[PDB]
Design a protein around this ligand. Sequence first.
Ligand SMILES: Cc1ncc(COP(=O)(O)O)c(CNC[C@@H](C)OP(=O)(O)O)c1O
Ligand SMILES: Cc1ncc(COP(=O)(O)O)c(CNC[C@@H](C)OP(=O)(O)O)c1O
Lengths: 356, 356
Amino acid sequence: AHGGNIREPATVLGISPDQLLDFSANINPLGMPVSVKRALIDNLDCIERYPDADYFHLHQALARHHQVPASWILAGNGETESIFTVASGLKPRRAMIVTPGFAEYGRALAQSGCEIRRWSLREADGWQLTDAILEALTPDLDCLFLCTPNNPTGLLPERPLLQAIADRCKSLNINLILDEAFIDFIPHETGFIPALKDNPHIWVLRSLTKFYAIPGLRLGYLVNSDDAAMARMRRQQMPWSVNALAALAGEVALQDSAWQQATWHWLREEGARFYQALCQLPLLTVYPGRANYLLLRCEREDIDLQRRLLTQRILIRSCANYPGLDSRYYRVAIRSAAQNERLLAALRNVLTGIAP
Amino acid sequence: AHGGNIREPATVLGISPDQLLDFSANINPLGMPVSVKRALIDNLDCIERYPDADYFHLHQALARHHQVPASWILAGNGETESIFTVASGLKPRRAMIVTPGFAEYGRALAQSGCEIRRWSLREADGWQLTDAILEALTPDLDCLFLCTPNNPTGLLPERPLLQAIADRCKSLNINLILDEAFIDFIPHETGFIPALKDNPHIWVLRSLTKFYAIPGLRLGYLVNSDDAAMARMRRQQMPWSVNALAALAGEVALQDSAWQQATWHWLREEGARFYQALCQLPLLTVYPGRANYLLLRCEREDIDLQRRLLTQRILIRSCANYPGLDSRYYRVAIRSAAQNERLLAALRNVLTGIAP
Ligand SMILES: Cc1ncc(COP(=O)(O)O)c(CNC[C@@H](C)OP(=O)(O)O)c1O
Ligand SMILES: Cc1ncc(COP(=O)(O)O)c(CNC[C@@H](C)OP(=O)(O)O)c1O
């Protein structure tokens, strides 16, 4: 049960989803780039033909964007498909995931028949990934999934720690899958694509749906420099999985040279202002997320924050279904100032004026 | 290597794909319904949110269309996804497919770890499915895939034979998967959805991409009346696989009450006129396909028809890669009269004036 389920949320209340303000999914509040919408409208008739099965133009655009060989890239029907593709293409016998984390890594691995080991983040560490994981990495592991920054904490592990993990993985023959779905939101963070050349054991997952606001179109991709392994992924993949409009949108989106700075500026300004306001609320712990969402811990047990905000027609993410987190945890997106203010006001009604 | 690969075909020639006339994919020549295009343009901003994970409106529309419980239906990112979903959801140990047939059944089963048995259609039978298959059906089979009408022959097995197969399957505990991807083109053919109520061993695959001309959007679905099995399919399925525009397009498409009659009329008129003209060509055998495509057998060995037509900038499907068919076999779509005439003229240049 993932976030962004507004139709389901509205159904629970008996109202139309157009009446809900959603903070349970984390999509760039700027909306899709104007050029993207124009291109979609202008080329809509392209849907009367099958997509290019090899997605030449799309992969060329992604390759030019990251300055890597097009052969290192495989686009997917959302990064969600890329996660299932890597799991099925690598068919690990034993794999480690880090909890709490995005639920699909586990679903994908389970379906592929893998023995899943969980590395548990600790509330006492403020949910930060630590070097304690290194000693937990063993030769018998085939894969390790890390999310950078993590869903739902928004925390980004230190580059040196990620490098230490990557190096250990290289020596223990472990494939390292880095989920960089939200990395574009963190100013100046390059991720690991610039370092794949001499590290064929590293796989990077990317998504265009949150940063460019096209989650309804579905577009993500996987990058890796092992010629043979990527070739195998191209087969284990279902044909025409990426729709023609997603491919077009992706190409156009990457051409908007102002999008990145505009998004970073918003995060640095409103995002910082929103975070400060949340931290001024009583009976609430707010974690220092680096992208467009924040993990919250409600210090009032006798209060289902999600149920309470839903009656106020504001949908938030309940993190109780993440392994490792309990009913006190929730996640909210960072949106436009006006919407953020409505969220804040709702939270105050449930948090201010209450004794410990 | 499926048909519709115009970008790849154009690349082989060193030209732009906009210069090719494609007869290698079989899409309704009328294009997408006008209401569908209007709805897509009017609701394009819906892509700024994730699709409804449960696709309520879409499944409700499909259920109303077939007058069956919405619980019997699962939409997919093209019927291609539905094929992979049924294979993975049923995880057959032994399964039978009929050759020649669409390549994805075999790919899907192979990936799921199934022992595949092939029932071979015979050139001496004019590639018709016969009752000889019944004795080949055994208790140890878990699944049987039939395509009605078949890709690439366009032949539709007799209802009584399909019923006999279905009944035998029911008694031998075999799941029967009927690929009805092209059934909408055959006037008055209802398929098996109207008969699923008391046959939970029957699974029907449907596609909206050829009949409504949205192969670039990707939309198909699976129907079955076994409560538990469909429930399992809803899990083995990847979340948000159907994009928001495909779901919208599907709902709108089903509301066009003139589309069906218009398409049937075209097939009965131009389709019949095209078929007759093909049959007047020398050194060519044309099979009696019932939908919008026809299988051709070139009686001139020393002539690669596809290569020869490609130089004339017309792309056709070579069926040499179908198990059971050799280099003499090709398939062509049935399109508009003008385009059909260009195809005919090209064929004449390669077939007329030549001695046996
Ligand atoms: C870390 C992470 N990785 C990959 C994806 C897949 O993205 P896409 O397929 O659109 O490219 C998501 C989406 N997450 C969407 C969100 C609604 O799910 P939760 O409430 O469980 O966080 C994600 O959060
Ligand atoms: C029998 C059959 N079933 C299912 C599909 C999948 O349809 P979709 O995913 O668009 O709903 C196709 C598509 N076939 C497309 C065609 C180009 O492939 P070939 O040249 O191998 O025949 C098909 O021919």
